[PDB]
Design a protein around this ligand. Structure first.
Ligand SMILES: C#Cc1c(-c2cnc3ccccc3c2)c2c(N)ncnc2n1[C@]12CC[C@](NC(=O)c3cncnc3)(CC1)C2
Length: 299
């Protein structure tokens, strides 16, 4: 016995059980649709996001089903679970609709109305989700602001298990990952560091202008990302601790939960943002029987 048996349920969804309403976005990753899932026996309507790829190949469906595996194996409030799969020629992955999109886009568009309370609560929530993945022996290998989804402004979740492994994004990776392809829970802490830096700069591109091949030399010299204008030394020290050369010297995710949650009790002591007190963030026939997927638990 090396590990415990994974007794997760892979739910297979009929094409008749759900309907694509519209396209949300297109990319290299694929095509994501907004939709409504209606389980046949129940009287519920569950808002969903359906992920297709751009052209069916065996290597594509291999990679889709590996994502499904990992995503069906997780259950935590700050981690995106897979609701099910649909067996089209190319496999479709179905999850919870996250109305406000990814956190990177959210901070760029809502830069002017994001308080210190929100930023620090997001740091806690991401640390909780990452700590859960560490408890499940899962290294994420691709934590970034683009792979955090926003259910509400008060509630974010980690996504993207396309690179997640059971124990390329050069500008989010630890030094040992770039040089030697070594990936641990502590290399995810580096990427957490860069993720926090993205949020505190309202979605700036890290090392903007510099090409990816020069990054390893930059980090070996001792250079790191700059202190964001809004950050106190207290917050920037946490980011700098995530980017230590010694991986064991970096914080644990459980420690990051503690540090940010202490800071979240008194947010204006740790982030300095102009006009912080003023900051506010938020079919008819469908709305009658709408249950959010987090309240629709497995029979
Ligand atoms: C990638 C994806 C994605 C996902 C998702 C992730 N992983 C998945 C894994 C398995 C199965 C399905 C998955 C679905 C997602 C979601 N569940 N709910 C809302 N949106 C989502 N997106 C986005 C697609 C376009 C989008 N656009 C904006 O955020 C935007 C742009 N411009 C102005 N405002 C907002 C960027 C990401 C929203």
């Amino acid at each position: 016995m090396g590990e415990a048996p994974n007794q997760a349920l892979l739910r297979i969804l009929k094409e008749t059980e759900f309907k694509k309403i519209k396209v949300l976005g297109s990319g290299a990753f694929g095509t994501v649709y907004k939709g409504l899932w209606i389980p046949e026996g129940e009287k519920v309507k569950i808002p969903v996001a359906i992920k297709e790829l751009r052209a069916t190949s065996p290597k594509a469906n291999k990679e889709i089903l590996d994502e499904a595996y990992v995503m069906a194996s997780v259950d935590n409030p700050h981690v995106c679970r897979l609701l099910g799969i649909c067996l089209t020629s190319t496999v479709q992955l179905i999850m919870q609709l996250m109305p406000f999109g990814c956190l990177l886009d959210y901070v760029r568009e809502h830069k002017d109305n994001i308080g210190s309370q929100y930023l620090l609560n997001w740091c806690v929530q991401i640390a909780k989700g990452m700590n859960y993945l560490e408890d499940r022996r899962l290294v994420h290998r691709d934590l970034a602001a683009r792979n955090v989804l926003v259910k509400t402004p008060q509630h974010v979740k980690i996504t993207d298990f396309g690179r997640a492994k059971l124990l390329v994004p050069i500008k989010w990776m630890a030094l040992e990952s770039i040089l030697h392809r070594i990936y641990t829970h502590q290399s995810d802490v580096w990427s957490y560091g860069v993720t926090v830096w993205e949020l505190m700069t309202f979605g700036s591109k890290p090392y903007d202008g510099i090409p990816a091949s020069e990054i390893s030399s930059i980090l070996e010299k001792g250079e790191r990302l700059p202190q964001p204008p809004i950050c106190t030394i207290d917050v920037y020290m946490i980011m700098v601790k995530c980017w230590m050369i010694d991986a064991d010297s970096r914080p644990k995710f459980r420690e990051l939960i503690i540090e940010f949650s202490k800071m979240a009790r008194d947010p204006q002591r740790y982030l300095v943002i102009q006009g912080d007190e003023r900051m506010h963030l938020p079919d008819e026939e469908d709305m009658d029987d709408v249950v959010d997927a987090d309240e629709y638990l497995i029979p």
